[PDB]
Amino acid sequence: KKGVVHGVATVAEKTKEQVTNVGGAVVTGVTAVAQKTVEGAGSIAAATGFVKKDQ
Amino acid sequence: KKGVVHGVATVAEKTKEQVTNVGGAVVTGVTAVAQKTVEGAGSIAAATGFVKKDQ
Amino acid sequence: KKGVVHGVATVAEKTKEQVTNVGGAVVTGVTAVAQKTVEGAGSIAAATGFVKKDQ
Amino acid sequence: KKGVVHGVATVAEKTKEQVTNVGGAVVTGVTAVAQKTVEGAGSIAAATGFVKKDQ
Amino acid sequence: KKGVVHGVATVAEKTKEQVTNVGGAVVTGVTAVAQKTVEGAGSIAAATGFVKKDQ
Amino acid sequence: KKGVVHGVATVAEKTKEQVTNVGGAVVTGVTAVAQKTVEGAGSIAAATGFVKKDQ
Amino acid sequence: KKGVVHGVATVAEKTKEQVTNVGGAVVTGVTAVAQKTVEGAGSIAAATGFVKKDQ
Amino acid sequence: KKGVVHGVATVAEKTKEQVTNVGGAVVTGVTAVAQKTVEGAGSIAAATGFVKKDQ
Amino acid sequence: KKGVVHGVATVAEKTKEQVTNVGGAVVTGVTAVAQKTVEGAGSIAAATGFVKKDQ
Amino acid sequence: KKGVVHGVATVAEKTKEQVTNVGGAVVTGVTAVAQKTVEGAGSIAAATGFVKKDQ
Ligand SMILES: Cc1ccc2nc(-c3ccc(N(C)C)cc3)sc2c1
Numbered sequence: 051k052k053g054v055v056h057g058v059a060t061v062a063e064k065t066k067e068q069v070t071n072v073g074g075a076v077v078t079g080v081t082a083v084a085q086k087t088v089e090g091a092g093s094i095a096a097a098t099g100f101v102k103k104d105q
Numbered sequence: 106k107k108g109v110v111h112g113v114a115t116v117a118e119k120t121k122e123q124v125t126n127v128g129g130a131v132v133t134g135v136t137a138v139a140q141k142t143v144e145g146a147g148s149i150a151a152a153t154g155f156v157k158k159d160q
Numbered sequence: 161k162k163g164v165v166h167g168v169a170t171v172a173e174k175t176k177e178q179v180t181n182v183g184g185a186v187v188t189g190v191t192a193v194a195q196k197t198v199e200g201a202g203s204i205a206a207a208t209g210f211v212k213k214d215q
Numbered sequence: 216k217k218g219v220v221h222g223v224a225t226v227a228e229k230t231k232e233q234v235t236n237v238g239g240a241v242v243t244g245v246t247a248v249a250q251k252t253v254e255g256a257g258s259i260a261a262a263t264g265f266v267k268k269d270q
Numbered sequence: 271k272k273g274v275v276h277g278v279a280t281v282a283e284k285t286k287e288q289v290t291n292v293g294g295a296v297v298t299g300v301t302a303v304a305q306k307t308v309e310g311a312g313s314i315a316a317a318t319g320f321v322k323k324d325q
Numbered sequence: 326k327k328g329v330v331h332g333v334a335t336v337a338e339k340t341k342e343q344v345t346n347v348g349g350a351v352v353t354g355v356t357a358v359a360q361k362t363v364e365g366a367g368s369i370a371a372a373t374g375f376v377k378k379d380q
Numbered sequence: 381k382k383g384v385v386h387g388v389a390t391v392a393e394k395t396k397e398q399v400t401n402v403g404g405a406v407v408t409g410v411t412a413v414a415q416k417t418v419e420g421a422g423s424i425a426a427a428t429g430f431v432k433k434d435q
Numbered sequence: 436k437k438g439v440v441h442g443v444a445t446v447a448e449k450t451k452e453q454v455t456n457v458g459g460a461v462v463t464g465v466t467a468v469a470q471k472t473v474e475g476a477g478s479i480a481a482a483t484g485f486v487k488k489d490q
Numbered sequence: 491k492k493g494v495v496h497g498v499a500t501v502a503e504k505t506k507e508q509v510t511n512v513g514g515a516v517v518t519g520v521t522a523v524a525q526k527t528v529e530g531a532g533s534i535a536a537a538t539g540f541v542k543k544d545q
Numbered sequence: 546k547k548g549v550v551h552g553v554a555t556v557a558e559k560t561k562e563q564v565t566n567v568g569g570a571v572v573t574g575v576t577a578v579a580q581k582t583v584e585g586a587g588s589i590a591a592a593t594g595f596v597k598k599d600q
Pocket residue numbers: 051052053054055059061106107108109110114116161162163164165171217218219226
């Protein structure tokens with residue numbers, strides 16, 4: 051076989067899960083957050099996949 | 106076989122999971138956060154995958 | 161076979177898990193955080209994969 | 216076979232797990248944090264994979 | 271076979287686990303932290319893979 | 326002061342939390358369950374407070 | 381002061397939470413269940429406060 | 436002071452938490468379960484407070 | 491002071507935590523379970539407080 | 546002072562923690578279990594407080 055990509059690719063066979071991202075956010079997984087009190091200014095309480103590039 | 110990529114690629118066969126990211130965040134995995142009190146200014150309480158590049 | 165990459169690639173066969181990242185965050189694994197009280201200003205309480213490049 | 220990379224590559228066969236990172240954070244492994252009280256200003260309580268390059 | 275890399279590569283065959291990092295953090299291993307009280311300003315309580323290059 | 330009980334009592338002052346149970350179940354605490362697949366016949370997957378007295 | 385109870389009582393002052401139960405079930409606490417697949421015959425998947433006295 | 440109990444009592448002053456149980460189950464504490472696959476017939480996967488008296 | 495009990499009592503002053511149990515299960519403490527695969531028939535995977543009196 | 550008990554009592558003053566049990570299970574302490582694969586039929590993987598009296 052032959053393949054040429056510029057990116058971003060994701061090429062496969064017999065594949066149970068696939069995610070391609072440029073951005074941005076993708077949530078595909080099981081996630082449970084239980085929480086009782088959030089205070090403070092300002093605290094990232096429960097972050098799973100996170101990116102902060104403030105300018 | 107033959108392959109030429111510029112990146113970012115992810116090329117495979119018979120593959121159960123795949124993630125390609127440029128960014129950005131991707132959450133595909135099981136995650137449970139149980140939490141009772143968050144205070145303080147400002148404290149990253151529970152971070153799993155995290156990136157902070159403030160300017 | 162033949163392959164030329166610029167990066168970042170991830171090339172394989174018969175492969176159960178794959179992650180490619182430029183960024184950024186990717187969470188694909190099982191993670192359990194149980195927590196009772198977070199205080200202080202400001203304390204990284206429970207960080208699993210973490211990157212802080214403040215300028 | 217033949218291969219030329221610029222990096223960062225990860226090239227393989229018959230491979231159970233793969234991670235490629237430039238960044239950034241990737242969490243793919245089992246992780247359990249149980250915690251009862253976090254105080255102080257500011258103390259990295261429980262860090263698994265961590266990078267701090269404040270300027 | 272023939273291979274020329276610029277780095278950082280990781281080239282292999284028949285390989286159970288692979289990690290390539292430039293950064294940054296990668297957590298792929300089993301990790302259990304149980305903890306009861308963290309105080310002080312500021313004490314790295316339980317660090318597994320850690321890098322601090324504050325300027 | 327004077328007190329006579331037959332039970333079950335719970336007598337106090339200045340008390341943040343109280344539970345009295347005869348039974349039966351009482352859930353008053355923070356609880357997070359994240360779960361991806363349960364199989365088998367029959368397996369108690371994730372039990373927190375549990376009592377089984379089958380006859 | 382004076383008090384005589386037969387039970388079940390719960391007597392207090394300045395008290396943030398109170399539960400009295402004979403039965404029966406009482407749920408007063410924060411609870412998050414995230415779940416993706418339940419199978420099997422028959423498996424208690426995620427039980428928090430539970431009592432089974434089948435005859 | 437004077438006190439006579441038959442049981443089960445729980446008598447106190449200045450007391451932050453109290454639980455009285457006859458049964459039965461009481462869950463008042465922080466609890467996080469993250470889980471990815473449960474199989475087998477039949478396996479108690481993650482049990483915190485547990486009692487099995489099958490007859 | 492004077493006290494006569496039949497049991498089970500728990501009598502105190504200035505007391506931060508109290509548990510009285512006859513049964514039965516009580517969970518009041520911080521608990522984190524992270525888990526990736528449970529198999530076998532039948533294996534107690536992660537048990538914290540546990541009692542099995544099958545007849 | 547004077548005290549007569551039948552048992553099981555737990556009598557005190559100025560006392561930070563108290564547990565009385567007849568049973569049964571009580572979990573009041575911090576506990577973290579991180580786990581990646583459990584197999585076999587049937588193996589007690591990670592047991593903290595445990596009692597097995599099968600008949
Ligand atoms: C659409 C596509 C298909 C196939 C493909 N194969 C690539 C490849 C194969 C082998 C190697 N080596 C490094 C040997 C490199 C890239 S890139 C690519 C893109």
